[PDB]
Amino acid sequence: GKDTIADIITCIRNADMNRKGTVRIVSTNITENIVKILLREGFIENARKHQERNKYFLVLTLRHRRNKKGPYLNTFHLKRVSRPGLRIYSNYQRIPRILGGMGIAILSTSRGIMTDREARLEGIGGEILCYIW
Amino acid sequence: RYWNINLEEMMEAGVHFGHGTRKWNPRMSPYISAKCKGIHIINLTRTARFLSEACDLVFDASSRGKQFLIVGTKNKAADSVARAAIRARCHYVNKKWLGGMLTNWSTTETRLHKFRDLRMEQTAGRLARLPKRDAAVVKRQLSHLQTYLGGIKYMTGLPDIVIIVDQQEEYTALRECITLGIPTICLIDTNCNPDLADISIPANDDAIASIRLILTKLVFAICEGRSSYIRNP
Amino acid sequence: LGNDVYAMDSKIKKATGFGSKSKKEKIRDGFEENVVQVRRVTKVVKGGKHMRFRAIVVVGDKKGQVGVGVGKAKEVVSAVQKAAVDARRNIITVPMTKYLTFPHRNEADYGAARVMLRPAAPGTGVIAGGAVRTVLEMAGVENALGKQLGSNNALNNARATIVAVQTMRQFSDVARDRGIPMEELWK
Amino acid sequence: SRYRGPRFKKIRRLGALPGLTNKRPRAGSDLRNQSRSGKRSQYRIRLEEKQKLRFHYGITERQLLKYVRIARKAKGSTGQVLLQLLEMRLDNILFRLGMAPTIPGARQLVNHRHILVNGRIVDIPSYRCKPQDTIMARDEQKSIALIQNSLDLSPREELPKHLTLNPFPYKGLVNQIIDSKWVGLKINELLVVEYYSRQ
RNA sequence: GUUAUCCGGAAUGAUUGGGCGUAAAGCGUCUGUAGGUGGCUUUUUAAGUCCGCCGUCAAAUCCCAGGGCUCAACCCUGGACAG
Ligand SMILES: [Mg+2]
Ligand SMILES: [Mg+2]
Ligand SMILES: [Mg+2]
Ligand SMILES: [Mg+2]
Ligand SMILES: [Mg+2]
Ligand SMILES: [Mg+2]
Ligand SMILES: [Mg+2]
Ligand SMILES: [Mg+2]
Ligand SMILES: [Mg+2]
Ligand SMILES: [Mg+2]
Ligand SMILES: [Mg+2]
Ligand SMILES: [Mg+2]
Ligand SMILES: [Mg+2]
Ligand SMILES: [Mg+2]
Ligand SMILES: [Mg+2]
Ligand SMILES: [Mg+2]
Ligand SMILES: [Mg+2]
Ligand SMILES: [Mg+2]
Ligand SMILES: [Mg+2]
Ligand SMILES: [Mg+2]
Ligand SMILES: [Mg+2]
Ligand SMILES: [Mg+2]
Ligand SMILES: [Mg+2]
Ligand SMILES: [Mg+2]
Secondary structure (H helix, E strand, O other), X not given: OOOOHHHHHHHHHHHHHOOOOOEEEEOOHHHHHHHHHHXXXXXXXXXXXXXXXXXXXXXXXXXXXXXXXXXXXXXXXXXXXXXOOEOOEEOHHHOOXXXXXXXXXXXXXXXXXXXXHHHHHHOOOEEEEEEXX | OOOOOOHHHHHHOOXXXXXXXXXXXXXXXXXXXXXXXOEEEEOHHHHHHHHHHHHHHHHHHHHOOOOEEEEOOOOHHHHHHXXXXXXXXXXXXXXXXXXXOOOOHHHHHHHHHHHHHHHHHHHHOOOOOOOHHHHHHHHHHHHHHXXXXXXXXXXXXXXXXXXXXXXXXXXXXXXXXXXXXXOEXXXXXXXOOOOOOOEEEEOOOOOHHHHHHHHHHHHXXXXXXXXXXXXXX | OOOHHHHHHHHHXXXXXXXXXXXXOHHHHOOEEEEEEEEEEEEEOOOOEXXXXXXXXXXXXXXXXXXXXXXXXXXXXXXXXXXXXXXXXXXXXXXXXXXOOOOOXXXXXXXXXXXXXXXXXXXXXXXXXXXXXXXXXXXXXXXXXXXXXXXXXXXXXXXXXXXXXXXXXXXXXHHHHHOOOHXXXXX | OOOOOOHHHHHHHHXXXXXXXXXXXXXXXXXXXXXXXXXXXXXXXXXXXXXXXXHHHOOOHHHHHHHHXXXXXXXXXXXXXXXXXXXXXXXXXXXXXXXXXXHHHHHHHHHOXXXXXXXXXXXXXXXXXXXXXXEEEOOOHHHHHHHHHHHHOOOOOOOOOOEEEEOOOOEEEEOOOOOOOOOOOOOOHHHHHHHOOOO
């Protein structure tokens, strides 16, 4: 648990590859925000919170299998960019865009977390958390 | 259109139970329901929706004029299939299933050519002019060709709908229809994976009663669909 | 019920003999076959070297429909032919853009062959290496960048290219998946 | 620096080349030996495309190359921009206005100072023509005579809509920049570009 | 055309961009000093990070836009992204 962000991302990727809709993730401001964003983008069905023994679990419903489990044309990819060993930052004009914009990029900036779209409207650069296909 | 199903009849014929919990495929864990005495109990509220959709597409496909196969190779399911197929006037496989029946058509059809020559031979009465070795040999040809080509011997052309009993033992049928672009409407017990069929109906394996229930429902759908394709063309 | 002899001779006359009927039907399929590679493979027997030809061949309409196929025979011609059929039954479709290029940038992996495709500006032509280039050219992609990294083997690179252009998502469909209007993702 | 070799030959191998020869080739008489290379390597195809281009316009390779660099520089579709550049050449606009028999003739004309661009004498073939430009004959007897007899005795009226011609003084006028459909040959520029990826 | 020199192709020293069960490659196994990374919540600060404005990073070169030697190479004016 040296990195929480990468961990969330990873659990998602694993549950996804295994064709399961439901994931338990540990909550945190970052986690919660990231998931919110993930919802307003439409990458994930629904999110909700649970509590036991002062632990918080966000469970995430995931988009249903593609017209069977066997014949899948599409998966859902996640990639950590800035990680504890190398922190990647970008100014306004270097802000990444994924596959011509089909995917998104998550930024942590002065005004909070957002997508690259929001950064382009508001004109801010910052730290790039991950890429999402 | 409606079909005949209720919780009470499916409770009657014994559809709701399946093989022991040592033997199960967790791939089926989403739509299973309970577990009793180390005997699994499969969800019937899913079973009714799948059986409804199955009889619906069976009705549309019968009405448009498409051709039907049915398959199970078991001991009881074979005696049930000859009669299911005669009652719906369809093509069947009960006895030993030959690899390549669907996928390799050309050689299967030449095998049918020579089986037809054999059917003309035997009724012509020209098997009485032969040495004893020749009649015993032509009778080997006959015995075999009847076993394998018995229920399909009417069909000319590639069958576009296939119906199947218990996909565990039926692997090659599933493979061949997966390959050729054919839909499979299949019976699932707790041991089988729900990849291999287009419409997979949760069902029972060991029971002759479940086989008869779901197969009579389906052959009734094919029968009313047979009235609708006797009308539409 | 009409007699069995006349109706079974009707299914015998409708399915034609392979010894009395010659074959060229293929240009009516609207396809073109392009031979990528011709190799002489060998099985060895107590007598000596038993020689065969392996042909790797792709088919396309140059209209956005393409496939790969592999075949084996004693003669160049026959293997070519088998390759043709195996390809035709294996065939798929490449997502295209109004300018005849790719939706986006993509990688692919098949065996030790890795393949890099990225969209281009109109008028750049197709720049790539043998397998990837023939596949893409036969698909009809007009402007494409590609480089095979990893291995050089023709066949694997072909299959990898197919894997690439198969996973390509066109914008309409990501709009439909995400559940968001096109113009919102455009920005 | 100019191609003085046999034309008909390059015509046979490459294809139909307007800027070279008006005489249609012989039946070809290669049907005796029936000698072929088998088929053509992709490379040979691309090479013959480029060769087509180059020999139609009378250009040297090293020249074509720098044209191509100019092309890759310009912002827009590469092959198209290239074809523009090749088609705005002076001896070429001279030819395509029918002021000349062929491109070698037009080159000869330009070279001997028989032409004027905006009342200024330009004797170099590769002069690049720009919009709103006057193509005139020099006012001397011989210049007029050449331009007249080569203009009138050739019946073709194809003039590709960016080119104006006026009757008595014979004032040619370049109106605008070429359109890709108005180009002077049948070529997939894509192929020439693909050949030049390696320079 | 040949030879020499350098970069390329070479993902063949790999940040972008590789590997280490059997192909070259996991110290024989631990304890631990420097060193690197390090869970959650609230506040602070503002070193990084981000945005705006200013100074400068000479002219020539490269990039864009015109102009001049008949064209081009070359020359001249004006201007700027980077960083
Ligand atoms: Mg900086
Ligand atoms: Mg074989
Ligand atoms: Mg690998
Ligand atoms: Mg390489
Ligand atoms: Mg010579
Ligand atoms: Mg290069
Ligand atoms: Mg030299
Ligand atoms: Mg290097
Ligand atoms: Mg080395
Ligand atoms: Mg290596
Ligand atoms: Mg060894
Ligand atoms: Mg070793
Ligand atoms: Mg060890
Ligand atoms: Mg060792
Ligand atoms: Mg040691
Ligand atoms: Mg230690
Ligand atoms: Mg320490
Ligand atoms: Mg610290
Ligand atoms: Mg932290
Ligand atoms: Mg300077
Ligand atoms: Mg300039
Ligand atoms: Mg000038
Ligand atoms: Mg300057
Ligand atoms: Mg600065």
